[PDB]
């Protein structure tokens, strides 16, 4: 089940999770009034722009599928205030953040139309992310927000725990690849935690030719991967890997790839489309102590990269 609410009706998402570009200087309109049918006002910037916007901090790492909105009704003086439009920014850090698109250019998502009633929007392609900001574009008399965020957790799904690249119980020791391009440091290839990424020697190498290996340290089920784009960097080089294979084994030494059962041939996963957004790729579970993940197509800057392992022990 992944259209559940996140937080912001029922507490769940504290406090201080929620921030804002700004907010109106008489103090009644803070970002913490921005929950979802809340009964004070809402959340409303000090200025009206298309430069503002309402700020939520997941903590973790979380599948974004659908966003609510409301606008308000002021308390003080009855009058109605509601966002019309907005877009949709998100982040795995809070520094490096991605819009929301839909084909080449932005979505636009289709809001309120009065001060009382939630529309709901789905997203078309769900996301992975941390940071959310919703960003207004149009608004009836000024901006007011309040919202509910819609979706689950990766690890909610059955043997579907994060094996180590994130939390670090995988070690630098176990983190290698067929070429790098520094003594480089294996954490630079962790989902998130890293904020540069595994680049191989010639980042615009041969398909098929250059790996990332991670050892789980002992024989597990493996279901899926979490792959991630590169930042690199003095000048920083937006890279990612935008389709690739798996190969997996017990002994480290033979190697047997995941198959797509149309093709009879290794599966070519799709990979990402923006250097920090990551995509969850899932199949079917797979005895494995040792992952390779092979880079078929990348961006302009080559192949750059940061990943997890999704599964679970042996039961």
């Given at each position: 089940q992944c259209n559940v609410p996140l937080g912001m009706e029922s507490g769940r998402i504290a406090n201080e999770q929620i921030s804002a570009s700004s907010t109106y200087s008489d103090?009644?309109?803070?970002?913490?009034?921005?929950?979802?049918?809340?009964?004070?006002?809402?959340?409303?910037?000090?200025?009206?722009?298309?430069?503002?916007?309402?700020?939520?901090?997941?903590?973790?790492?979380?599948?974004?599928?659908?966003?609510?909105?409301?606008?308000?009704?002021?308390?003080?003086?009855?009058?109605?205030?509601?966002?019309?439009?907005?877009?949709?920014?998100?982040?795995?850090?809070?520094?490096?953040?991605?819009?929301y698109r839909h084909?080449?250019?932005?979505?636009?998502?289709?809001?309120?139309?009065?001060?009382?009633?939630?529309?709901?929007?789905?997203?078309?392609?769900?996301?992975?992310?941390?940071?959310?900001?919703?960003?207004?574009?149009?608004?009836?008399?000024?901006?007011?927000?309040?919202?509910?965020?819609?979706?689950?957790?990766?690890?909610?799904?059955?043997?579907?725990?994060?094996?180590?690249?994130?939390?670090?119980?995988?070690?630098?020791?176990?983190?290698?690849?067929?070429?790098t391009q520094e003594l480089w440091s294996p954490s630079a290839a962790r989902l998130v935690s890293s904020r540069s990424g595994w680049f191989p020697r010639i980042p615009q190498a041969q398909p098929g030719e250059e790996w990332l290996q991670v050892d789980l340290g002992t024989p597990k089920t493996v279901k899926g991967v979490i792959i991630q784009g590169a930042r690199g960097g003095a000048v920083e080089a937006r890279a990612f890997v935008r389709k690739f294979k798996v190969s997996y084994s017990l002994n480290g030494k033979d190697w047997e790839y995941i198959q797509d059962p149309r093709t009879q041939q290794p599966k070519l996963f799709e990979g990402n489309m923006h250097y920090d957004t990551p995509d969850i790729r899932r199949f079917d579970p797979i005895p494995a102590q040792y992952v390779r993940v092979y880079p078929e197509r990348w961006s302009p800057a080559g192949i750059g990269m940061r990943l997890e392992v999704l599964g679970c022990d042996w039961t």
């Open positions: 103090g009644r309109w803070t970002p913490q009034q921005s929950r979802l049918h809340g009964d004070d006002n809402g959340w409303t910037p000090n200025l009206d722009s298309n430069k503002e916007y309402l700020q939520v901090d997941l903590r973790f790492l979380t599948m974004l599928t659908a966003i609510a909105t409301q606008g308000a009704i002021s308390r003080e003086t009855q009058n109605g205030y509601y966002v019309k439009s907005y877009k949709l920014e998100v982040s795995t850090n809070g520094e490096d953040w991605m819009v084909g080449k250019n932005h979505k636009v998502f289709q809001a309120n139309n009065d001060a009382t009633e939630v529309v709901l929007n789905k997203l078309h392609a769900p996301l992975l992310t941390r940071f959310v900001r919703i960003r207004p574009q149009t608004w009836h008399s000024g901006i007011a927000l309040r919202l509910e965020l819609f979706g689950c957790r990766v690890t909610d799904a059955p043997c579907s725990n994060m094996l180590g690249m994130l939390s670090g119980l995988i070690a630098d020791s176990q983190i290698s690849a067929s070429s």
